[PDB]
Scaffold this active site. Structure first.
Site, mmCIF file in Angstrom:
data_model
loop_
_atom_site.group_PDB
_atom_site.id
_atom_site.type_symbol
_atom_site.label_atom_id
_atom_site.label_comp_id
_atom_site.label_asym_id
_atom_site.label_seq_id
_atom_site.Cartn_x
_atom_site.Cartn_y
_atom_site.Cartn_z
ATOM 1 N N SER A 46 0.801 -1.217 0.000
ATOM 2 C CA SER A 46 0.000 0.000 0.000
ATOM 3 C C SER A 46 0.839 1.275 0.000
ATOM 4 O O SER A 46 0.261 2.363 -0.103
ATOM 5 C CB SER A 46 -0.928 0.025 1.218
ATOM 6 O OG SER A 46 -1.897 -1.018 1.158
ATOM 7 N N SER A 107 -5.638 3.741 3.928
ATOM 8 C CA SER A 107 -5.176 2.665 3.054
ATOM 9 C C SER A 107 -6.346 1.967 2.356
ATOM 10 O O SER A 107 -6.285 0.775 2.044
ATOM 11 C CB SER A 107 -4.307 1.658 3.817
ATOM 12 O OG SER A 107 -3.319 1.154 2.948
ATOM 13 N N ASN A 109 -8.579 0.263 -0.058
ATOM 14 C CA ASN A 109 -8.285 -0.387 -1.337
ATOM 15 C C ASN A 109 -9.300 -0.030 -2.418
ATOM 16 O O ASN A 109 -8.931 0.208 -3.578
ATOM 17 C CB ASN A 109 -8.176 -1.898 -1.166
ATOM 18 C CG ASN A 109 -6.870 -2.309 -0.550
ATOM 19 O OD1 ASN A 109 -5.829 -1.730 -0.847
ATOM 20 N ND2 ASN A 109 -6.915 -3.307 0.320
ATOM 21 N N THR A 212 1.825 3.576 5.409
ATOM 22 C CA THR A 212 2.172 2.191 5.707
ATOM 23 C C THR A 212 1.863 1.252 4.532
ATOM 24 O O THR A 212 1.131 1.582 3.590
ATOM 25 C CB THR A 212 1.389 1.718 6.928
ATOM 26 O OG1 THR A 212 0.004 2.008 6.716
ATOM 27 C CG2 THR A 212 1.874 2.426 8.192
ATOM 28 N N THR A 214 1.340 -3.339 4.159
ATOM 29 C CA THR A 214 1.463 -4.709 4.631
ATOM 30 C C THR A 214 1.319 -5.604 3.420
ATOM 31 O O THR A 214 0.329 -5.492 2.688
ATOM 32 C CB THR A 214 0.354 -5.043 5.636
ATOM 33 O OG1 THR A 214 0.362 -4.078 6.697
ATOM 34 C CG2 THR A 214 0.546 -6.429 6.231
ATOM 35 N N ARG A 220 6.233 -5.590 5.752
ATOM 36 C CA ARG A 220 5.706 -4.472 6.537
ATOM 37 C C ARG A 220 6.550 -3.247 6.238
ATOM 38 O O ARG A 220 7.763 -3.248 6.471
ATOM 39 C CB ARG A 220 5.716 -4.789 8.041
ATOM 40 C CG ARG A 220 4.961 -3.777 8.902
ATOM 41 C CD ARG A 220 3.473 -3.817 8.587
ATOM 42 N NE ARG A 220 2.674 -3.140 9.608
ATOM 43 C CZ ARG A 220 1.743 -2.227 9.370
ATOM 44 N NH1 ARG A 220 1.478 -1.821 8.133
ATOM 45 N NH2 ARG A 220 1.072 -1.719 10.395
HETATM 46 C C1 LIG Z 1 -1.498 -2.162 1.957
HETATM 47 O O1 LIG Z 1 -0.363 -2.592 2.030
HETATM 48 C C2 LIG Z 1 -2.654 -3.082 2.243
HETATM 49 C C3 LIG Z 1 -3.358 -3.402 0.935
HETATM 50 C C4 LIG Z 1 -2.303 -3.807 -0.065
HETATM 51 O O2 LIG Z 1 -4.256 -4.494 1.131
HETATM 52 C C5 LIG Z 1 -3.604 -2.382 3.180
HETATM 53 C C6 LIG Z 1 -3.884 -3.308 4.355
HETATM 54 C C7 LIG Z 1 -3.221 -2.684 5.562
HETATM 55 S S1 LIG Z 1 -4.516 -2.010 6.528
HETATM 56 C C8 LIG Z 1 -3.796 -1.234 7.926
HETATM 57 C C9 LIG Z 1 -4.888 -0.972 8.950
HETATM 58 N N1 LIG Z 1 -4.171 -0.209 9.954
HETATM 59 C C10 LIG Z 1 -4.542 -0.195 11.103
HETATM 60 N N2 LIG Z 1 -4.889 -0.157 12.260
HETATM 61 C C11 LIG Z 1 -2.455 -1.571 4.955
HETATM 62 C C12 LIG Z 1 -1.421 -0.762 5.572
HETATM 63 O O3 LIG Z 1 -1.478 0.473 5.425
HETATM 64 O O4 LIG Z 1 -0.482 -1.306 6.201
HETATM 65 N N3 LIG Z 1 -2.769 -1.359 3.773
#
Ligand SMILES: *C(=O)[C@H]([C@@H](C)O)[C@H]1CC(SCCNC=N)=C(C(=O)O)N1
Length: 268
Positions: A46, A107, A109, A212, A214, A220
């Site tokens: 993401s 984030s 989608n 961020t 994942t 990560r």
């Molecule tokens: C990004 O890497 C993914 C996407 C590719 O499916 C989404 C899923 C997680 S959601 C994080 C929720 N945070 C929470 N408390 C992310 C991410 O930003 O790590 N993006």
């Protein structure tokens, strides 16, 4: 040597956590401050949603897109982790700006794919990287399959150094107007998903904004900027730790934040 301590401390985390840690820290002009595995490729996950929002702002700045334009959609656009898209579904649209802010700060989608549908898909995202001087980062797929992170696959990858330089270009290198630059900076500071990652390891008086990611198979990531007093930096962190739990991966990235902090403070 502070940079030697930086390298040694990252390598200790790698050994103890069975992890690979890619880091690049650059100044506003893209000059290297420090790095580790800085030109190894890692899946973006993401993290590409920040460059995607920059692409959208370039189009808003130019006039080829309008921030308040309504993007209509149906339930076909709801995919895994689409919290804002789901809430706006009954209304039938999100604006360009609403979608971009949800992509960056939640984030989301579905919101990301809504914007990809408008701007020309992965090929257009990749062309934007090239336009701003990044010959490395590539988007090949939409979400969530772009986060598959199949070992060895070069699709949907960047390197820490290329992404840090892209972040610097967007925030400091004049890619966007002053107004759009400030808006995207504030979105990164107000990100809702990064409380346990890099910014948990940086001092509380540093201004920090980040995005961020994942990925499957233990990815990560966290990319963005920090301002230590008057000194601005762009940073990209990509980690792979297949044996850690999700919480331990957050703590790994926070630990990288502390290692970065120790370097920056000591080199003053
Ligand atoms: C990004 O890497 C993914 C996407 C590719 O499916 C989404 C899923 C997680 S959601 C994080 C929720 N945070 C929470 N408390 C992310 C991410 O930003 O790590 N993006």
């Amino acid at each position: 040597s502070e940079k030697l301590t930086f390298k040694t401390d990252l390598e200790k985390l790698e050994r103890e956590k069975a992890a690979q840690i890619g880091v690049a820290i650059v100044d506003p002009q893209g000059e290297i401050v420090a790095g580790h595995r800085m030109a190894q490729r890692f899946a973006m996950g993401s993290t590409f949603k920040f460059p995607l929002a920059a692409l959208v702002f370039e189009r808003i700045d130019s006039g080829t897109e309008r921030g308040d334009r309504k993007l209509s959609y149906g339930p076909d656009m709801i995919v895994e982790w689409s919290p804002a898209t789901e809430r706006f579904l009954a209304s039938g649209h999100m604006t360009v700006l609403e979608a971009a802010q949800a992509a960056v700060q939640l984030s989301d989608n579905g919101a990301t794919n809504l914007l990809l549908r408008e701007i020309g898909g992965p090929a257009a995202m990749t062309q934007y990287f090239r336009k701003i001087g990044d010959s490395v980062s590539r988007l090949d797929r939409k979400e969530p399959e772009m986060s598959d992170n199949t070992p060895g696959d070069l699709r949907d990858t960047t390197t820490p150094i290329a992404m840090a330089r892209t972040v610097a270009k967007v925030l400091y290198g004049g890619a966007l107007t002053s107004t759009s630059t400030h808006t995207i900076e504030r979105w990164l500071i107000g990100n809702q998903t990064g409380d346990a990652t890099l910014r948990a390891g940086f001092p509380k008086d540093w201004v920090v904004g980040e995005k961020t990611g994942t990925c499957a198979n233990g990815g990560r990531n966290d990319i963005g900027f920090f301002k230590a007093q008057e000194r601005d930096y762009a940073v990209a962190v990509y980690t792979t730790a297949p044996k850690l739990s999700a919480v331990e991966r957050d703590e790994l990235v926070a630990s990288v934040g502390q290692v970065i902090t120790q370097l920056i403070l000591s080199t003053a």
